[PDB]
Amino acid sequence: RNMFCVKPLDLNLDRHANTALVNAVNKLVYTGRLIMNVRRSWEELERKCLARIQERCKLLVKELRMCLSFDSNYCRNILKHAVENGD
Amino acid sequence: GLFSLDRSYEEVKAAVQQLQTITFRDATFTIPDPVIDQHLLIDMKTACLSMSMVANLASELTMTYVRKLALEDSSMLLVKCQELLMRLPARPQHVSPDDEIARLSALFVMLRQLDDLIREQVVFTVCDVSPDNKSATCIFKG
Numbered sequence: 001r002n003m004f005c006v007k008p009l010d011l012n013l014d015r016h017a018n019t020a021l022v023n024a025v026n027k028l029v030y031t032g033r034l035i036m037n038v039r040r041s042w043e044e045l046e047r048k049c050l051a052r053i054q055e056r057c058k059l060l061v062k063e064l065r066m067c068l069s070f071d072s073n074y075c076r077n078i079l080k081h082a083v084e085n086g087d
Numbered sequence: 088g089l090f091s092l093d094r095s096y097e098e099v100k101a102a103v104q105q106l107q108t109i110t111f112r113d114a115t116f117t118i119p120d121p122v123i124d125q126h127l128l129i130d131m132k133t134a135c136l137s138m139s140m141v142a143n144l145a146s147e148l149t150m151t152y153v154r155k156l157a158l159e160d161s162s163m164l165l166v167k168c169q170e171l172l173m174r175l176p177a178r179p180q181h182v183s184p185d186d187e188i189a190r191l192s193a194l195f196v197m198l199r200q201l202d203d204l205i206r207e208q209v210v211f212t213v214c215d216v217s218p219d220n221k222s223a224t225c226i227f228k229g
Binding site for chain 2: 015
């Protein structure tokens, strides 16, 4: 839900049960799954933003095209750039 | 020799008196002149080194066997040997046969070192006795 407040605090693994290897594997899989989840959420929001801004650029260029003025052509030229990267 | 270290003169006197007397096959023999020279000092030094290396090499499995057996077995052997010892389920927290065998081999070398202090060299092996026990026929081992 919120990838900025990292809470890696799941340390509760008591030693009496399970062999040491399984304890280590459980800690490792927990950390790995946290990293994977945060990276996945980041990428999904990034691609949503890119898709939405590309759609808006398309619609706004289509609308500004209808008038051929200096201001309108200047705005279309600004929107003409591809926006499929963060940079 | 080992007991002589840091025990009073009279305490060592009493200990030497009691350790002198040996009973073996229903006859009693006494050691003449147990004297702590340098010749026994070398043996004491190697005994201390051998014991310390045994203690450092022995694994927690080796140490804890006695304690674990005492919790679930009872016998004259066990109660006797634990009376000789200090006083104080769950899984073993480290398990590795390869480490255990390497450690056991080194411990075998050390236990040979310690045994050679009391172990005399065999010179004859007996297979006969005259019924009066005056003579025997033996194989020479030298």
